[PDB]
Design a protein around this ligand. Structure first.
Ligand SMILES: CN(C)C(=O)[C@@H](c1ccc(-c2ccc3ncnn3c2)cc1)[C@H](N)C(=O)N1CC[C@H](F)C1
Ligand SMILES: CN(C)C(=O)[C@@H](c1ccc(-c2ccc3ncnn3c2)cc1)[C@H](N)C(=O)N1CC[C@H](F)C1
Ligand SMILES: *[C@@H]1O[C@H](CO)[C@@H](O[C@@H]2O[C@H](CO)[C@@H](O)[C@H](O)[C@H]2NC(C)=O)[C@H](O)[C@H]1NC(C)=O
Ligand SMILES: *[C@@H]1O[C@H](CO)[C@@H](O[C@@H]2O[C@H](CO)[C@@H](O)[C@H](O)[C@H]2NC(C)=O)[C@H](O)[C@H]1NC(C)=O
Ligand SMILES: *[C@@H]1O[C@H](CO)[C@@H](O[C@@H]2O[C@H](CO)[C@@H](O)[C@H](O)[C@H]2NC(C)=O)[C@H](O)[C@H]1NC(C)=O
Ligand SMILES: *[C@@H]1O[C@H](CO)[C@@H](O[C@@H]2O[C@H](CO)[C@@H](O)[C@H](O)[C@H]2NC(C)=O)[C@H](O)[C@H]1NC(C)=O
Ligand SMILES: *[C@@H]1O[C@H](CO)[C@@H](O[C@@H]2O[C@H](CO)[C@@H](O)[C@H](O)[C@H]2NC(C)=O)[C@H](O)[C@H]1NC(C)=O
Ligand SMILES: *[C@@H]1O[C@H](CO)[C@@H](O[C@@H]2O[C@H](CO)[C@@H](O)[C@H](O)[C@H]2NC(C)=O)[C@H](O)[C@H]1NC(C)=O
Ligand SMILES: *[C@@H]1O[C@H](CO)[C@@H](O[C@H]2O[C@H](CO)[C@@H](O)[C@H](O)[C@H]2NC(C)=O)[C@H](O)[C@H]1NC(C)=O
Ligand SMILES: *[C@@H]1O[C@H](CO)[C@@H](O[C@H]2O[C@H](CO)[C@@H](O)[C@H](O)[C@H]2NC(C)=O)[C@H](O)[C@H]1NC(C)=O
Ligand SMILES: *[C@H]1O[C@H](CO)[C@@H](O[C@@H]2O[C@H](CO)[C@@H](O)[C@H](O)[C@H]2NC(C)=O)[C@H](O)[C@H]1NC(C)=O
Ligand SMILES: *[C@@H]1O[C@H](CO)[C@@H](O)[C@H](O)[C@H]1NC(C)=O
Ligand SMILES: *[C@@H]1O[C@H](CO)[C@@H](O)[C@H](O)[C@H]1NC(C)=O
Ligand SMILES: *[C@@H]1O[C@H](CO)[C@@H](O)[C@H](O)[C@H]1NC(C)=O
Ligand SMILES: *[C@@H]1O[C@H](CO)[C@@H](O)[C@H](O)[C@H]1NC(C)=O
Ligand SMILES: *[C@@H]1O[C@H](CO)[C@@H](O)[C@H](O)[C@H]1NC(C)=O
Ligand SMILES: *[C@@H]1O[C@H](CO)[C@@H](O)[C@H](O)[C@H]1NC(C)=O
Lengths: 728, 728
């Protein structure tokens, strides 16, 4: 008896996971949505009031997609007409509402088709981007001040990122940074004038007679990259001059010699900004720390404050150089960098001294720095129990580094091993977000004494429901290879019995710094496959995976399509030798990098796998973007790494696909991994006479996240998997 | 005990039908290529001589695609560097070889990337089109005269057709017509200035980093059409000092009042040319007969010599107004037109007389006029035994229309019921090409007493091999629907046992004026399905089908996607009631128009079919080209026929696909039926949550004919059909 977790349950989302998303508006108050209306909460006592009743914007005539309150609480930014673009970019309309006089502002409005908008860090100043140009409003109802006049669609981007900077560098559309108290506005400018365009058809509703051709500047591996410049304007002078000057801060000579990237912007004080640059050969980066010269209104970065960060074994950072966290006075900062052993740790820097001091160490890594006060630095690491897949919050005493307290380890060790945190404005309070291995648990805490204030959401409602369902179990463990240990996890069917032979599906990602073996609780397709189809679903983090030191992460340096592919195959061998796996029913599947690796594995001729599914895969590195591809592969030229670029394609293994059952799937409007990539795979297969299954998804992008397509693709894949394992 | 016709046999052509393609060069001799050699045959006795050694160009360098001897046998055009474009268009390089002086002309040679070339009907003048302009060479080695200078890629076409005119009107790339003795050169000029462009990606070889975008002027239904002008230039009076003069012949006023097309051009004499114009609303056409005025130098088309052809029930002609066949003196002509009963017969016209006289009549139709002498007119019709799917050669005494003699009906009634013919210059001799129901038979005959001279090719070699294989049989019969008989054919498995239940596959086309039930012998996919898989393959010609009169053909006027779809379901319904059909295993498949009907059938909710396959189907008429679509559907505007355009889509029927298995295939480089069509279908299916099979063919067009793709698509569809029918 007791129903199992079925496909419909997953697709229809019957068993919902509750969460508690709050927004700190001060040092002890936060916002929270409870029944369409917005409540403000007093962190200290848990009491609240209705900040904005849901019926406030009833007769607005528009569905409000999101809202944003200015720092001073005097105004609220209403966003509507949301139109998604890439992963982070989108356009929308905006109206500003005056919270005091409870009126909606109807004059000097933010234009429609606005690309980005942000309040100043203090007060209620506004900066926005329209038609690729920057604008600043000192007051919600006053005319804007134009900052740039160069804006030009697909050519010059002021204050916003182009496709590649948005996707691979800043993971954001915005490229502007208000100084701490809002006086200055810094921004980047990108020029894609000579960047080659990716073009593909977009069909739209059937009412469109002629298909549309989407054209976006996108630099493939080895192609011409966009250039970039950085500026800073003093917004306090806008109302005093006709045309305020944007002062440029040039990149250091060590970068100007070749193609480079702006990879980080972080203010230190009211008059000090830090910038990190990265060479197109991403193994060398420089940080300039620039100060405002009040007598010249210029910005100067002293070479004595310049910091170099390079890697002899790979690229710099997990995906890019890490951000610095400055002490109040801006004279020192903390940054996560790889130590002599290859493990990322927190290094303490004096701004005008090149040698830093590590304040943490060990055979584990710091994930990120979360908060810094004058007494303590808080961070999340996977040190607890030597489990690279766990995450915990720690506190370290700035006056005595031997004093490190773990703030989350023992809170509920059996239910919570993967933590995330959110501090109030001055870090007086913090919300802990436990997301695994048990049901997510959200709690609020007081920083002054680290005492639990109360439980915010325990998901008791879901635990209630999950009691009447045969849920699968999860095993997180490791196997030893060449002395080093590699982690893996298994979603095991209910009432698992190791005396039996279960079919096994290898779920893979395996890209650089990836981690599929963790303690997070998930309700996904693997849940259904294990609970209903009694299939074991496994994942493995072999060479190239992250959070375990550069010896493992940089092993695939300049060699993608090798060790991370082979290790995935070896993983399957090890699992079968565990005795509860049916060597005759072993499948593999992956999306994105997972698809590439899955394809490479299905075409290796290993005989280990019976069938596999690749969704939106990369097929040859020269088809993917420069920033990401070159980071691990260097340049596709004969003097660099061309031979390996040409040796790591899926297409060259076409012939071996005769040994397996393959299902290739790709969205046609995929702007990230172009359909082109699967189009070349299918062609190579047709060319050598290989039969396989295929599915395209009209107008879907890399996420194939459209509600209907999402359900359609997981249904199609389920049939394929069930058939391959002949359940049925 | 004897093999069967396997899938590999069909894909590798192990069983080749022999042909005999000859080329008449006079009234008594023809050319035939044997062992790469070209021989000249004397029709009367059968003796031959070598005309050109297969080794004459043994050291030519390039691979010769094709040859073409000038009418006077003095020169030979060599074609190479062939590069295909659409259905008939291509560019190539040419070279001329002097047969007399056994030398290859090296001066003033045809340019590379030539779009079209042709000898004058007599002698050895040349006319070619390059970069959209027309050129003429009086002599192979002399410099050419530029006739036009307005030529512009994708914009102005002189002497060659644009996309729609190539595909739907002239079925050729050529748009120039030499006068009978080569004095005059007539040509059309197309302007696609305001024609929207269809755009789709082309991926090319794996090495191309960025997909290319193909753009071609293609008018979809209701869009802006290309305009056209007609010119005639005297090539006998060309000067190398002055730019050639082209005299324009404007269309009649009844045509200039609105959009229209030039649909036929046929010279009547050395100084008289005829042109047929067609209104955009394709049910009204006009023929002009224009004479050259020696003193004036202009071409005059007397209104008294105008001939109007219209239709009150549909469009004009089978696909377009038929071509006239003028008498020697050009004063009268014969032309196939629909008579008062709606049957296509030959009418005799006086050039300055409004009424024509039908010389044939009956409930059957003339397919084409093949030869005309002062005593007889030779034509092919399907009159014999009242079989609309049969074709025979007839001659009718021009002095007594009651004297009609069939020349092929009785030559071999059991083996031959479908003939084609090729007459020599003055109809002194004719070649008969029988293509069914038995193996193809080619014979030569003399007109004087209709003697059977000799057998050219009887395919006895193929017959010998076929006796060692279990070949299927063909049943051609008819069913009655409302006092009307409609024909069908069934390809029956070897040893057909009417006491057994066979699965059945409906092979459908069903387009307007289509015929899928004939007496033609074919070796195709259906042969393998029947011979090896024991599957009956049926085809049916319902309302909308051709060669049976307008009452049937015009049944679908302004109503595509209705009767022709309904009639296929009715046929299947009837076949499913026959004792030898397993009503639980009935499938349907089609390509092009057939893919549209197949999709409309699967989405009908009839419950008759278990599975179906659609290859490159049309999904909604507004996506297809204007000339073909509007011919049958009128314009897609509210005041015309928009409602039916919207009610006849595949998409609106998505929901009804839940009860069937559907496989949708399409080439991504299809310039005819754009990938868009299947893209909208898949998206609609996804939107209602209906699972299905799909396959795209990278860079393949509407014919998916490349060797690898051809083999791959039929392999994939075979797996699909066998699986649907539970066949090993
Ligand atoms: C998992 N994921 C989000 C990614 O893989 C995408 C990806 C996007 C952004 C980052 C990224 C960028 C900056 C950054 N600073 C700190 N972390 N951090 C991560 C890392 C990965 C990647 N651009 C992609 O879509 N493909 C597709 C093909 C290839 F596998 C990489
Ligand atoms: C079979 N065949 C060659 C066709 O169907 C194509 C087609 C092309 C040309 C003609 C055509 C044009 C002129 C003509 N003069 C005498 N016969 N004749 C036939 C008739 C049909 C059609 N343009 C097509 O490809 N689609 C695609 C979608 C729709 F089904 C029609
Ligand atoms: C939460 O509850 C407390 C306790 O009632 C409220 O405290 C206010 O405290 C200020 C200063 O300490 C006093 O001047 C007020 O009298 C108290 N509020 C009222 C309404 O009297 C606090 O306002 C509440 N906060 C929220 C967000 O509801
Ligand atoms: C963006 O970069 C392009 C170069 O890639 C710059 O364009 C050049 O501008 C100069 C100055 O007018 C011209 O002489 C060159 O011919 C231009 N080259 C090209 C390829 O266009 C452009 O100035 C930059 N734009 C901005 C705002 O910096
Ligand atoms: C504000 O100042 C900027 C920069 O000084 C002006 O931009 C220049 O505009 C001129 C012509 O309009 C161009 O030739 C320069 O190339 C521009 N420079 C830059 C950096 O864009 C801008 O036009 C000024 N705006 C106003 C209203 O005066
Ligand atoms: C935000 O920081 C800026 C920069 O320090 C402050 O502006 C300076 O204010 C001092 C007054 O102590 C003046 O002497 C300088 O001329 C100002 N510099 C500039 C560049 O404007 C600003 O006052 C701070 N804002 C707030 C609200 O404190
Ligand atoms: C093709 O026919 C044309 C037209 O009838 C012939 O050209 C005419 O020939 C006569 C007799 O020589 C001249 O008087 C006319 O002036 C010509 N008319 C034109 C328009 O040129 C031509 O001779 C014939 N060509 C051949 C090769 O016989
Ligand atoms: C040719 O076909 C057209 C379109 O069917 C006929 O024109 C009219 O079409 C509209 C609808 O589009 C009807 O309301 C009219 O009744 C049609 N007739 C007329 C005279 O307007 C047209 O009649 C047909 N021509 C011939 C010669 O049959
Ligand atoms: C076919 O045979 C005839 C003779 O039977 C060939 O001869 C005719 O043409 C020759 C030159 O082409 C002449 O030399 C003969 O005198 C002439 N004979 C007659 C009766 O006309 C003819 O050429 C042959 N044709 C081929 C293509 O071989
Ligand atoms: C081809 O057609 C175009 C129109 O479709 C002709 O140009 C016309 O349209 C122009 C703009 O589209 C107008 O400016 C003109 O009034 C008109 N003529 C010209 C010369 O522009 C164009 O001339 C045609 N070309 C030929 C060779 O006939
Ligand atoms: C068309 O192309 C061919 C090949 O390019 C030309 O022939 C010559 O080819 C040789 C090598 O094969 C080259 O060295 C020459 O430059 C080519 N041209 C000549 C004149 O020698 C041919 O000439 C071209 N003709 C036209 C009209 O484009
Ligand atoms: C807010 O709106 C919800 C509807 O989403 C309603 O159920 C709730 O009672 C409202 N609460 C208030 C305070 O208006
Ligand atoms: C934005 O669009 C709306 C809807 O058309 C329009 O009425 C409004 O005036 C626009 N606002 C601005 C600032 O352009
Ligand atoms: C950076 O990487 C390139 C490519 O391998 C290498 O040649 C160069 O020496 C590296 N620089 C450093 C500091 O390791
Ligand atoms: C001409 O060449 C072909 C193959 O290129 C060969 O089969 C044939 O024998 C040759 N012709 C003659 C007459 O030898
Ligand atoms: C012919 O016409 C073209 C374009 O109209 C012109 O450029 C060329 O010079 C002319 N040649 C002569 C010989 O008139
Ligand atoms: C006759 O048969 C046709 C189909 O051929 C059918 O649609 C129609 O309703 C029947 N009756 C008449 C009067 O045509």
């Amino acid at each position: 008896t007791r129903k199992t977790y079925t496909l419909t349950d997953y697709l229809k989302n019957t068993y919902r996971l509750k969460l508690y998303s709050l927004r700190w508006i001060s040092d002890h108050e936060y916002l929270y949505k409870q029944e369409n209306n917005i409540l403000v909460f007093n962190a200290e006592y848990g009491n609240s009031s209705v900040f904005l009743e849901n019926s406030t914007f009833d007769e607005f005539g528009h569905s409000i997609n999101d809202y944003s309150i200015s720092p001073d609480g005097q105004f609220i930014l209403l966003e509507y007409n949301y139109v998604k673009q890439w992963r982070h970019s989108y356009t929308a309309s905006y109206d500003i509402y005056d919270l005091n006089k409870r009126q909606l502002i109807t004059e000097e409005r933010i234009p429609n088709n606005t690309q980005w908008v942000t309040w100043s860090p203090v007060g209620h100043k506004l900066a926005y981007v329209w038609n690729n140009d920057i604008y600043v409003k000192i007051e919600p109802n006053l005319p804007s001040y134009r900052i740039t006049w160069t804006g030009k669609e697909d050519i010059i981007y002021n204050g916003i990122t182009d496709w590649v900077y948005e996707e691979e560098v800043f993971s954001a559309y915005s490229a502007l940074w208000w100084s701490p108290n809002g006086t200055f506005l810094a921004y980047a400018q990108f020029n894609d004038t000579e960047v080659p365009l990716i073009e593909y058809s977009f069909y739209s509703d059937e009412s469109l007679q002629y298909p549309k051709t989407v054209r976006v500047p996108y630099p493939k591996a080895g192609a011409v990259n966009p250039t970039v410049k950085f500026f800073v304007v003093n917004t306090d002078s806008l109302s005093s001059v006709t045309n305020a000057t944007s002062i440029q801060i040039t990149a250091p000579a060590s970068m100007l010699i070749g193609d480079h990237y702006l990879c980080d912007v972080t203010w230190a004080t009211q008059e000090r900004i830090s910038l990190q640059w990265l060479r197109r050969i991403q193994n060398y980066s420089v940080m300039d720390i620039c100060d405002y010269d009040e007598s010249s209104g210029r910005w100067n970065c002293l070479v004595a404050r310049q910091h170099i960060e390079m890697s002899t074994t790979g690229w710099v950072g997990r995906f890019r150089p890490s951000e610095p966290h400055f002490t109040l006075d801006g004279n020192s900062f903390y940054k996560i960098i790889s130590n002599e052993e290859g493990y990322r740790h927190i290094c303490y820097f004096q701004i005008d001294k090149k040698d830093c001091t590590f304040i943490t160490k060990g055979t584990w890594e710091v994930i990120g720095i979360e908060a810094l006060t004058s007494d303590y630095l808080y961070y999340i690491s996977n040190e607890y129990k030597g489990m690279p897949g766990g995450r915990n919050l720690y506190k370290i005493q700035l006056s005595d580094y031997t004093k490190v307290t773990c703030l989350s380890c023992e809170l509920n060790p059996e239910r919570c091993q993967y933590y995330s945190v959110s501090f109030s404005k001055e870090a007086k309070y913090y919300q802990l977000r436990c997301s695994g291995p048990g049901l997510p648990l959200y709690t609020l805490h007081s920083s002054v004494n680290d005492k639990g204030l109360r439980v915010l959401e325990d998901n008791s409602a879901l635990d209630k429901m999950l009691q009447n369902v045969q849920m699968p179990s999860k095993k997180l463990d490791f196997i030893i290879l060449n002395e080093t240990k590699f982690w893996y996890q298994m979603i095991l069917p209910p009432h698992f019995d190791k005396s039996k032979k279960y079919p096994l599906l290898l779920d893979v990602y395996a890209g650089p710094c990836s981690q599929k073996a963790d303690t997070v609780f998930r309700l996904n397709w693997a849940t259904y496959l294990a609970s209903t189809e009694n299939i074991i679903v496994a994942s493995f983090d072999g060479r190239g995976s992250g959070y375990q030191g550069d010896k493992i992460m940089h092993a695939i340096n300049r060699r993608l399509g090798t060790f991370e592919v082979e290790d995935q195959i070896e993983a399957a061998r090890q699992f079968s030798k565990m005795g509860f796996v049916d060597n005759k029913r072993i499948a593999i599947w992956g999306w994105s990098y997972g698809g590439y690796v899955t394809s490479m594995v299905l075409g290796s001729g290993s005989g280990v796998f019976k069938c596999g599914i690749a969704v939106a895969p990369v097929s040859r590195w020269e088809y993917y973007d420069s920033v990401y591809t070159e980071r691990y592969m260097g340049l596709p030229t004969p003097e660099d790494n061309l031979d390996h670029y040409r040796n790591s394609t899926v297409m060259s293994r076409a012939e071996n696909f005769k040994q397996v059952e393959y299902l290739l799937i790709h969205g046609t409007a995929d702007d990230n991994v172009h359909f082109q990539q699967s189009a070349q795979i299918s062609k190579a297969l047709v060319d050598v006479g290989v039969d396989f299954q295929a599915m395209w998804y009209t107008d879907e992008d890399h996420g194939i996240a459209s509600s209907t397509a999402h359900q359609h693709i997981y249904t199609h894949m389920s049939h394929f998997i069930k058939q391959c394992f002949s359940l049925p």
